Amino acid sequence: MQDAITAVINSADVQGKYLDGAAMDKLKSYFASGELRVRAASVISANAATIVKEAVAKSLLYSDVTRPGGNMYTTRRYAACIRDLDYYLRYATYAMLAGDASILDERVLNGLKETYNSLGVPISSTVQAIQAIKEVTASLVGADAGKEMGVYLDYICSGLS
Amino acid sequence: MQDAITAVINSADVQGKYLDGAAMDKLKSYFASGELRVRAASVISANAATIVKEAVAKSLLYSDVTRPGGNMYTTRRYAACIRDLDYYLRYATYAMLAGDASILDERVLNGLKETYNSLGVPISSTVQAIQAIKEVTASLVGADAGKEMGVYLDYICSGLS
Amino acid sequence: MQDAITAVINSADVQGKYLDGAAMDKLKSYFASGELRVRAASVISANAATIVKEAVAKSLLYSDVTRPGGNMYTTRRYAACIRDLDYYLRYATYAMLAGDASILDERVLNGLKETYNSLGVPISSTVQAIQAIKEVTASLVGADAGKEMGVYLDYICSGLS
Amino acid sequence: MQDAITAVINSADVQGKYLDGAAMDKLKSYFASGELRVRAASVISANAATIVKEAVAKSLLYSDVTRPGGNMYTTRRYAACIRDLDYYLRYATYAMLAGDASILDERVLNGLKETYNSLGVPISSTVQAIQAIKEVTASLVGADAGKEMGVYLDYICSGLS
Amino acid sequence: MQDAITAVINSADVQGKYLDGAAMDKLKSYFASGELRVRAASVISANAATIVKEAVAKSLLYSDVTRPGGNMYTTRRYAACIRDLDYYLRYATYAMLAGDASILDERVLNGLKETYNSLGVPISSTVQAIQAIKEVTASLVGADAGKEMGVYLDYICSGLS
Amino acid sequence: SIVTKSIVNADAEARYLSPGELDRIKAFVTGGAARLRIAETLTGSRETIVKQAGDRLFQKRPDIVSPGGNAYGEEMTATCLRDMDYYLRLVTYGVVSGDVTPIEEIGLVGVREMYRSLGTPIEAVAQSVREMKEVASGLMSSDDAAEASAYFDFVIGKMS
Amino acid sequence: SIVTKSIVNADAEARYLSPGELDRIKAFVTGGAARLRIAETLTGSRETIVKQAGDRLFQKRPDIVSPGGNAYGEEMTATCLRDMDYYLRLVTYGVVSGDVTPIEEIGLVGVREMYRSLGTPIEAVAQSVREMKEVASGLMSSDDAAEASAYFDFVIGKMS
Amino acid sequence: SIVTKSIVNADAEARYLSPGELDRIKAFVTGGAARLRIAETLTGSRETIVKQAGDRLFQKRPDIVSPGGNAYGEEMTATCLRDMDYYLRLVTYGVVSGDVTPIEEIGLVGVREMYRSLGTPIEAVAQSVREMKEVASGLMSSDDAAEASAYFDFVIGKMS
Amino acid sequence: SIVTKSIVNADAEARYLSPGELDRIKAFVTGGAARLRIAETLTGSRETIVKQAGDRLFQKRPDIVSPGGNAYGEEMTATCLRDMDYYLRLVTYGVVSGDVTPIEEIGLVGVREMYRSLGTPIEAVAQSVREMKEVASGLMSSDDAAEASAYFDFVIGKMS
Amino acid sequence: VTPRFVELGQVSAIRTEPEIAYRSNQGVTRQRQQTKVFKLVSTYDKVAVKNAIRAAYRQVFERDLEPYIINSEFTALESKLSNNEINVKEFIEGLGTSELYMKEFYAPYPNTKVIEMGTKHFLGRAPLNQKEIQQYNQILASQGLKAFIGAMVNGMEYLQTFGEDTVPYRRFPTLPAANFPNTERLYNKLTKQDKELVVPSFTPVVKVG
Numbered sequence A, B, C, D, E: 001m002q003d004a005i006t007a008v009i010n011s012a013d014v015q016g017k018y019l020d021g022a023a024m025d026k027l028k029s030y031f032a033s034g035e036l037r038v039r040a041a042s043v044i045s046a047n048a049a050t051i052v053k054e055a056v057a058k059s060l061l062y063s064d065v066t067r068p069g070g071n072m073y074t075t076r077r078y079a080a081c082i083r084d085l086d087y088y089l090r091y092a093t094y095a096m097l098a099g100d101a102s103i104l105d106e107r108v109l110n111g112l113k114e115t116y117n118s119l120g121v122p123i124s125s126t127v128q129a130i131q132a133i134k135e136v137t138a139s140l141v142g143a144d145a146g147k148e149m150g151v152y153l154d155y156i157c158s159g160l161s
Numbered sequence F, G, H, I: 001s002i003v004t005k006s007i008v009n010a011d012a013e014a015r016y017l018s019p020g021e022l023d024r025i026k027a028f029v030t031g032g033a034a035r036l037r038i039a040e041t042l043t044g045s046r047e048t049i050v051k052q053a054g055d056r057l058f059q060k061r062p063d064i065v066s067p068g069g070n071a072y073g074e075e076m077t078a079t080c081l082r083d084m085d086y087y088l089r090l091v092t093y094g095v096v097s098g099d100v101t102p103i104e105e106i107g108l109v110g111v112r113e114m115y116r117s118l119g120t121p122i123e124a125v126a127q128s129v130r131e132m133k134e135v136a137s138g139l140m141s142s143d144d145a146a147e148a149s150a151y152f153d154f155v156i157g158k159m160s
Numbered sequence J: 001v002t003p004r005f006v007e008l009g010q011v012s013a014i015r016t017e018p019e020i021a022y023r024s025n026q027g028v029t030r031q032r033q034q035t036k037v038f039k040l041v042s043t044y045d046k047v048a049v050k051n052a053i054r055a056a057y058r059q060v061f062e063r064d065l066e067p068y069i070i071n072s073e074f075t076a077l078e079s080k081l082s083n084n085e086i087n088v089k090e091f092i093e094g095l096g097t098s099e100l101y102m103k104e105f106y107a108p109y110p111n112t113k114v115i116e117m118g119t120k121h122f123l124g125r126a127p128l129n130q131k132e133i134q135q136y137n138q139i140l141a142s143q144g145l146k147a148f149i150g151a152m153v154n155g156m157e158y159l160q161t162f163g164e165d166t167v168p169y170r171r172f173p174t175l176p177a178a179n180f181p182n183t184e185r186l187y188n189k190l191t192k193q194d195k196e197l198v199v200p201s202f203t204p205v206v207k208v209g
């Protein structure tokens, strides 16, 4: 896992080259975005417990998934579902702080797709749930920070896609 | 794992409904099985090492398998095969008490064929030994309870082979 | 594992007979070769650290692996290469002293191919390094004594090939 | 296989939408690159035999592979490598002209790994020959055409690695 | 842990002096006694189980200890006592081989006395059993070896007493 | 199911079924007729039992339906009664199995996460299932009501 | 084998074989003529050695041949003779290899489990091995007798 | 980078970053401008800095470049300066990242083993890094000189 | 000692020493005479060996005795010669014990940290150990020199 | 003319984006360094104790045990650990010999898979060789589950690697052979990801007898 700064450093190290103008411009872009990312992180850790509530309420409540026979019935399944949403929210916030999708490749999306397939859980409904949490987080974190959160959430969906 | 009672409970839970007569009669059947299966389990646990003893004595014993070159050769491999027979007897009586063979698939047949192939264990000799323990247990517990013991042991053989 | 003495023992024990004249002669042949094997092993152990030096120098140094971004860049990775070459030399010495190429299969080649493939280690580059090991040791322990080390390093290469 | 022009089409059609501004801009970018792509493809086709000859001269010739016993020995095998390098160059040209490296993993990389493993082909030696071809073509087609050709050849090598 | 050689080395090193004539003489004495120590250790390892058998039978069986109300009552306590005696004999043999009683010091005595005090184990009965083991093992190893073996067993008794 | 964790406990110790567990299975199989009777009596009387339990729950603690409550919506009351039905089915399954395996393994593990996510107080549903126990004992035979109230006590205490 | 044992010990510490280990292998290979002669002698008198050992064992431990004993008929005495032959062969293998790892790997690890599954008194098996040791010592030189008796005593100790 | 360390600590603790971690990242971002200025100053004088560092190192340790030494030939001295360029590039990476993590990860783990394998005196490499630090500080502000000398001293200490 | 190592290995598996271990112990006690002869040879000429090795190392490494070096001054050089005597004594202990455990326990654990605290070039210590090695090998038999070479090389490698 | 050392350190070719992505993560994953090791240095800081307990839950069970419990059933163990009456090793062993652990990683798997999961959770890597698998098999068959985790945790390897105060964590062993790839396969798949055996049994190179 590497953030934007460490990603740039590793990319420069791959060619054995110093930080050229692109290196400094990307670094300054990340430094400018750091203020927004930190404030959005504070705001999202503010409501990480509550945000997933309306994220699932408008996504996976009173539907075929929650009822018996659905893959979200039974307290273990609902608890694992809310915990999965919490994991996605926390790790996407981690990526937003780091400003890189590297963490999601190995710590979230690595083995998640076939894990869900073996579990039999509906991947498409998870996709819509992550979209719903996308709008929910965009509502609280703002537009630009909302877009930064949404790009990572869409990356999670695409990996789970 | 799961028994016949839990099997019916899961089947009624998938529909998210109460137990009906169509499950009522099948629970009556298992309850009527009852003392027969539990007599059988007690008697099987009685001389637990015995059935393994004469079963190995009549099928694999005094044969090329126990001779040099055969996979039953050497004291370590002898103990390993005997321990495998104890596994098979214990899990078969487990299934008989529970009334479902899923525990075997959940505990016995999972990877047993592949692990034996990696170890180069003769599958045919093991299946014959399990048939031996089947007939020994049938002679030791009676016809009916011997019949459930035989069906579970034959399921073990079919999954293994 | 296995060696020449254990090789003869297993050959006699697979069919269960004692040691006949042929096994006796094979054991005497191994004992005759034991002097050369012990001398070569002692010489290689004395110069084991030195050999990998010029082996890497004439086969891996100043090449694409060593440049930045190469798999042998990142000095931790250089030390990993030195350690792996030392392991190869030590286990080849083990096989030479034992006289059987069985230790390599169950202690070196076991998962090494998949290890390097998962790690992205250049297999042909490692093969060339082991070949350089063979040439260097052949010029250090003599031709006849170096023949066995060449045989076992070649076994390692073929398993890794 | 997929190219830069149909890549946008599939990307837009997976969600079922039409071609928006982003897709239009991607198509215009590919059409702008088409000039250099066509020129590079024509120049490479004109000089394919000489390119593969020069790549073989500076990467494979006068080495262990070409010596007797080596995989380059047995002139049928040398012609097989000439044919393989011609295939790699031609399919890299196909991918460069297409703008997407999907033909590489669909008509070249599909099954190549176990092919070379079964044939005992030096994978790293072939990779080195591919970088030699990349360097030769980059010094003949220019900087940007060489850029794209090196990108696709390195994709082929990474598939090999 | 320390043996005669290490004991002499440490005794010389604490004063920071080289091995003098007395240390040389002690090392020579230990080397001379090494043959007898090895023979006694081999004999004891050949009949350790029988030694414990006979010592327990002559010193503990059919006494107030083995009867109900004694410490050795119940199969669990009997097995614990037998294991204790076996470990006593084995560690005494280790000390006899090493020529020093330190291994008894930090592998048999530290915590043993107050452990027996906490569990109420009779120290006097244990001492009598160890004396029985002493004479039984003397009867096997001859007077010369039995002197050293009983010296170490009496050291164990004195520490435990 | 008594037999399911009996066998699980035996397997965890790598031993056959002990005489005590065997005898417990003996008594369970011999007395399963009463358990099936209780299953039928709970299945048949579902509507009245849930109705009276919910009404007494509402009358004891109006805050569940008071302004700002999690059940102020007319639909929220029906959702709560659906929860009542779910727990009643769980109790029926447990009394059928002779053991509390299905209650915990259908509607108990992680219920606190359930209610923190949905905001429903745990004590409120505990009181609701207490009312269920009370009305069931009212409608049930005394000896049968003993075991039914025992399982209701289990669910209320463990979920409390 | 001594080479295998030393190699395993060195590999455990992740180091090349020490000079003492190399000296041990060199001495073993140099002296291998005596070990090969010992194995040849043991294999040569195998029939008489096993016959005398079993005969002396049977009057030494009549229970194994007594009614109710494990080996009552001539058929079971055949199994006793076969087991004693296996152990003599294992002793010869250890003698030639110079180390007890072949013996332990072939017929010592889990031997108690085998003789428990067969009902055989392991103590009497140890006694039979001891009788074979005595009869072998009667058919060898003092130093050769001691060299064979080392592995015989190892087998006896592990058995008992 | 402090960002990656904070993320790793949070993930290992399975929590969002605490307020203090957020302030630490905030101050890191604020000082990123000065850190980038320092990195640009170091990068702009790479060739010069390596020239004086190598010249002063060879003045202090003439044996390494003398005949028979590790760095005798012109190619060997070029390889010395290549290693020196590598280490200064790593120092620039660390200054950009604000922590010595990239320096340790790419060029400080197992460096002792590498230079022992190559026969290069590790103390001489540390002296070369010290010359690097001195010459770089000679052309930087005092505060920036100290900020870069922190990473330079970290590399020197790890080499020593 | 090899006896201590064998006892530790046996206690690790909770088994009596195998016949191979007893044979190795017997060989070690037989060779104890040669071990003691080598130890006496090393101890008799300890002062001359230490003095010659110190002079040779000073000739190779004048910096340590150069101004500003660790060993500058008569007392500092005397302390270094005392350290050389200490390591020669440790080598003698390893020779008599037949292994390297006493050397590792006394003067090879934490030696790097200790000398880094003292500001001593560890490479200079390794070179001094080497010089002591050649000095001892010159005045001692070929086989004795080879046997002591193992301990000297172990000390040198631990230094380096 | 460019300086010679620049050319020596200069990388050949252009090093396009695909090679950058491939070679940025080339060898062992950065998770070997991008992880935290929990040591209960002092018992006076209750927050640190709770963090260590949660880490132990996440390690042994691979997850936080929120959606898998009725209540906190390890409360007594947590109190004893926070009271400095037991070590972190004792807490880990108690978590191993708990009904929750048996329900999770013992009930739904064969004893070979049980050995795999136990070695992956407490020891931190995959089983070394066939002898270890055999030994754990006899332990499981003769004494059940509790003796298995007891033998693993109280072994010399656990004390030398994790000790009495360090929570177990995923390891990256070099030796023995195939231990590293087996451990990588064990830890590269999520909990309940799939059911086949990553290391069913080491195929013997030599068939003794």
Ligand SMILES: *[C@@H](C)[C@H]1/C(=C/c2[nH]c(/C=C3N=C(/C=C4\NC(=O)C(CC)=C4C)C(C)=C\3CCC(=O)O)c(CCC(=O)O)c2C)NC(=O)[C@@H]1C
Residues within 6 Å of the ligand: D061, D062, D063, D066, D067, D072, D073, D074, D075, D078
């Ligand atoms: C002069 C008499 C003729 C001539 C020969 C020539 N050959 C090469 C180079 C190579 N020749 C071979 C041939 C073989 N390799 C094989 O494995 C087999 C038998 C199975 C054959 C026949 C190869 C592979 C090479 C190149 C690789 C290598 O040399 O190892 C050269 C040099 C070419 C160059 O540019 O280096 C020459 C001169 N050439 C003529 O014009 C004459 C007819």
Ligand SMILES: *[C@@H](C)[C@H]1/C(=C/c2[nH]c(/C=C3N=C(/C=C4\NC(=O)C(CC)=C4C)C(C)=C\3CCC(=O)O)c(CCC(=O)O)c2C)NC(=O)[C@@H]1C
Residues within 6 Å of the ligand: E057, E060, E061, E062, E063, E066, E067, E068, E073, E074, E075, E078
């Ligand atoms: C007779 C057909 C079987 C038989 C029995 C047998 N036992 C012994 C000796 C002992 N048995 C015990 C066992 C216990 N003592 C206890 O207090 C309890 C706790 C519940 C048990 C289980 C003991 C301790 C002894 C030793 C003497 C003593 O009690 O202190 C013998 C004689 C052994 C001897 O050498 O004297 C015999 C014969 N043996 C068989 O072969 C039959 C199967």
Ligand SMILES: *[C@@H](C)[C@H]1/C(=C/c2[nH]c(/C=C3N=C(/C=C4\NC(=O)C(CC)=C4C)C(C)=C\3CCC(=O)O)c(CCC(=O)O)c2C)NC(=O)[C@@H]1C
Residues within 6 Å of the ligand: A061, A062, A066, A073, A074, A075, F057, F064, F070, F071, F076, F077, F079, F080, F081, F082, F083, F086, F087, F106, F107, F108, F118, F119, F120, F121, F122, F123, F124, F125, F126, F128
């Ligand atoms: C009324 C006095 C009580 C109450 C009820 C209540 N429940 C919900 C919502 C839900 N309850 C569940 C319950 C379960 N799911 C299961 O799988 C199981 C059995 C295994 C149970 C018991 C679920 C899934 C939901 C959501 C969807 C649904 O309604 O079925 C609400 C709504 C609260 C909200 O904000 O959504 C209410 C009011 N609440 C209380 O306070 C009382 C204890």
Ligand SMILES: *[C@@H](C)[C@H]1/C(=C/c2[nH]c(/C=C3N=C(/C=C4\NC(=O)C(CC)=C4C)C(C)=C\3CCC(=O)O)c(CCC(=O)O)c2C)NC(=O)[C@@H]1C
Residues within 6 Å of the ligand: C057, C061, C062, C063, C066, C067, C072, C073, C074, C075, C078, H064, H069, H070, H071, H076, H077, H079, H080, H081, H083, H084, H086, H087, H106, H107, H118, H119, H120, H121, H122, H124, H125, H128
């Ligand atoms: C003079 C400054 C010192 C010196 C240097 C020296 N180094 C080599 C050879 C190599 N140096 C390296 C170094 C690295 N590899 C990495 O990945 C990194 C971290 C980013 C570093 C610093 C390597 C890999 C080599 C060998 C491979 C190669 O050179 O490409 C030499 C030449 C060795 C030879 O035998 O050719 C020299 C001279 N040597 C000294 O004595 C000075 C202290």
Ligand SMILES: *[C@H](C)[C@H]1/C(=C/c2[nH]c(/C=C3N=C(/C=C4\NC(=O)C(CC)=C4C)C(C)=C\3CCC(=O)O)c(CCC(=O)O)c2C)NC(=O)[C@@H]1C
Residues within 6 Å of the ligand: A060, A065, A071, A072, A076, A077, A078, A080, A081, A082, A084, A085, A087, A088, A091, A107, A108, A112, A115, A119, A121, A122, A125, A126, A129, J063, J190, J191, J192, J193
């Ligand atoms: C919720 C949006 C959907 C849903 C969830 C659900 N998940 C599980 C089970 C698991 N979920 C995971 C996923 C992860 N665990 C991790 O540590 C991480 C790393 C970032 C992830 C992504 C795993 C591993 C499991 C299996 C183990 C477990 O029990 O948690 C379940 C239960 C599955 C079961 O059979 O019990 C459920 C219900 N279900 C839906 O229908 C939603 C769309």
Ligand SMILES: *[C@H](C)[C@H]1/C(=C/c2[nH]c(/C=C3N=C(/C=C4\NC(=O)C(CC)=C4C)C(C)=C\3CCC(=O)O)c(CCC(=O)O)c2C)NC(=O)[C@@H]1C
Residues within 6 Å of the ligand: B060, B065, B070, B071, B072, B073, B076, B077, B078, B080, B081, B082, B084, B085, B087, B107, B108, B112, B115, B119, B121, B122, B125, B126, B129, J110, J111, J112, J130, J133, J134, J137, J138, J201, J204
């Ligand atoms: C006996 C019927 C046949 C036979 C068997 C044999 N098995 C082994 C080794 C193992 N057997 C198992 C099996 C299991 N482990 C489990 O957990 C389960 C379910 C609970 C099963 C079925 C395993 C894992 C091993 C390897 C580890 C061990 O020894 O415990 C051997 C020895 C293999 C070897 O040499 O390594 C043998 C010989 N042999 C026969 O001849 C019979 C036909």
Ligand SMILES: *[C@H](C)[C@H]1/C(=C/c2[nH]c(/C=C3N=C(/C=C4\NC(=O)C(CC)=C4C)C(C)=C\3CCC(=O)O)c(CCC(=O)O)c2C)NC(=O)[C@@H]1C
Residues within 6 Å of the ligand: E065, E070, E071, E072, E077, E078, E080, E081, E082, E084, E085, E087, E088, E107, E108, E109, E112, E115, E119, E121, E122, E123, E125, E126, E127, E129
């Ligand atoms: C037998 C000669 C006497 C006897 C034995 C006895 N011991 C125990 C319990 C323990 N004994 C020990 C001993 C040791 N631990 C060590 O590390 C060493 C060195 C190897 C020794 C000697 C320990 C630790 C225990 C407790 C733990 C355990 O038992 O495993 C008992 C059990 C007492 C009880 O009530 O449980 C007994 C009976 N008893 C006699 O009467 C003999 C004189």
Ligand SMILES: *[C@H](C)[C@H]1/C(=C/c2[nH]c(/C=C3N=C(/C=C4\NC(=O)C(CC)=C4C)C(C)=C\3CCC(=O)O)c(CCC(=O)O)c2C)NC(=O)[C@@H]1C
Residues within 6 Å of the ligand: B060, B061, B062, B063, B066, B067, B073, B074, B075, B078, G057, G064, G069, G070, G071, G076, G077, G079, G080, G081, G082, G083, G084, G086, G087, G106, G107, G108, G118, G119, G120, G121, G122, G123, G124, G125, G128
């Ligand atoms: C004779 C003095 C003792 C005795 C012997 C006895 N053994 C058996 C049966 C078997 N014994 C073995 C032995 C071995 N298997 C191995 O792999 C090894 C070498 C590594 C040995 C020594 C075996 C294999 C069998 C089974 C038969 C077969 O060949 O497959 C019996 C028969 C028991 C029965 O009831 O059938 C007997 C009698 N019994 C005693 O009482 C003496 C102490």
Ligand SMILES: *[C@H](C)[C@H]1/C(=C/c2[nH]c(/C=C3N=C(/C=C4\NC(=O)C(CC)=C4C)C(C)=C\3CCC(=O)O)c(CCC(=O)O)c2C)NC(=O)[C@@H]1C
Residues within 6 Å of the ligand: C060, C065, C070, C071, C072, C076, C077, C078, C080, C081, C082, C084, C085, C087, C088, C107, C108, C112, C115, C119, C121, C122, C123, C125, C126, C129, J026, J027, J028, J029, J172, J173, J174, J175, J176, J177, J178, J180, J181
């Ligand atoms: C060096 C010339 C080539 C090369 C090798 C390389 N390997 C690793 C890492 C590991 N190597 C192994 C191999 C083994 N472990 C064993 O037990 C055995 C038997 C003795 C073998 C062969 C393992 C397990 C690893 C991973 C664990 C570890 O690194 O300690 C690396 C470094 C990987 C990293 O991330 O640091 C390297 C560089 N790579 C090349 O490019 C050369 C051709």
